[PDB]
């Protein structure tokens, strides 16, 4: 019962964007901060440009293109869109520049100046992003603070669609094949049976919120991933973070229930966190909260990709 996917995949010429600086590098390739300048449009768009190494396997290219396929098909304010791809000797993926980086890194770097209003807003925005993916019948399969990016301190987006799977309109579970997997973010059913669902994404949401609430701590730190599934069967979960009222923590705990259907729906998580976003000091207890404030390069013609629509 699926509608046709009429998303446009935009093919970019290399002459249309200029790389400025190197954000990061890898065997896979190097990511560049740059500007995209669409031909004859008098606009400059801050972008991140992923250029793969020429030493790339056809298995590797195949995987990245499926990621682009997913990224091109999504249109939501809390999900990263693929602007386009460039088919050069080495393939280049173009996405919206997220200047403040990884949300995991941001909370670690700024743990001193982050108040309860920001934390709850982020939980709301991530829930919306996931709720949207759920609407598109998508299962992310890798939700975690490392895969949320910061456009600005006030705006965050879900990213890393490498493990994402579309669900047949009929089907409710995706059954995986063996791979390297983010054990400590995974629903039990995923770990035991390689079963994934929107509810298994809810589990990971739960862990992702805990990362934020503990300003970037490592879940189940010092305990081997090989022992995680038994601990979960024993009924142990991550501990209540110091700043958390029982209200918030109760919500995380619900995400980690063994019966996936007993976990909350993303639309419910939206509701409950935004209720708390209204009176943040009531729900997160942070020292000197009411005092904290959170916020490089021809910027005349510069436009954010969020305002560049086609």
């Amino acid at each position: 019962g699926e509608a046709p996917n009429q998303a446009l995949l935009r093919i970019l010429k290399e002459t249309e964007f200029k790389k400025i600086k190197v954000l990061g590098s890898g065997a896979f390739g190097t990511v560049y901060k740059g500007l995209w300048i669409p031909e004859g449009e008098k606009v400059k768009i801050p972008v991140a440009i992923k250029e793969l190494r020429e030493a790339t396997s056809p298995k590797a290219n195949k995987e990245i293109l499926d990621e682009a396929y997913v990224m091109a098909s999504v249109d939501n304010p809390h999900v990263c869109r693929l602007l386009g791809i460039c088919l050069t000797s080495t393939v280049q993926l173009i996405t919206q520049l997220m200047p403040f980086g990884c949300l995991l890194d941001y909370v670690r770097e700024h743990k001193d100046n982050i108040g309860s209003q920001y934390l709850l807003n982020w939980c709301v925005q991530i829930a919306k992003g996931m709720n949207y993916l759920e609407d598109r019948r998508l299962v992310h399969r890798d939700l975690a603070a490392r895969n949320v990016l910061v456009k600005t301190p006030q705006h965050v987006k879900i990213t890393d669609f490498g493990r994402a799977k579309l669900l047949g309109a009929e089907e409710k579970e995706y059954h995986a094949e063996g791979g390297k997997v983010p054990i400590k973010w995974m629903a039990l059913e995923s770990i035991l049976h390689r079963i994934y669902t929107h509810q298994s994404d809810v589990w990971s949401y739960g862990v992702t919120v805990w990362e934020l609430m503990t300003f970037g701590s490592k879940p189940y730190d010092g305990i081997p991933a090989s022992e995680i599934s038994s601990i979960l069967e024993k009924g142990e979960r991550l501990p209540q973070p110091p700043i958390c009222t029982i209200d918030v923590y109760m919500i995380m705990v619900k995400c980690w229930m063994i019966d996936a259907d007993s976990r909350p729906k993303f639309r419910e998580l939206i509701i409950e966190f935004s209720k708390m976003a209204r009176d943040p000091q009531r729900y997160l207890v942070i020292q000197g909260d009411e005092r904290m404030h959170l916020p490089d390069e021809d910027m005349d013609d510069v436009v954010d990709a969020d305002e560049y629509l086609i």
Partner: peptide, 7 residues
Amino acid sequence: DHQYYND
């Protein structure tokens, strides 16, 4: 220090 493990 690896998030992803085989299994």
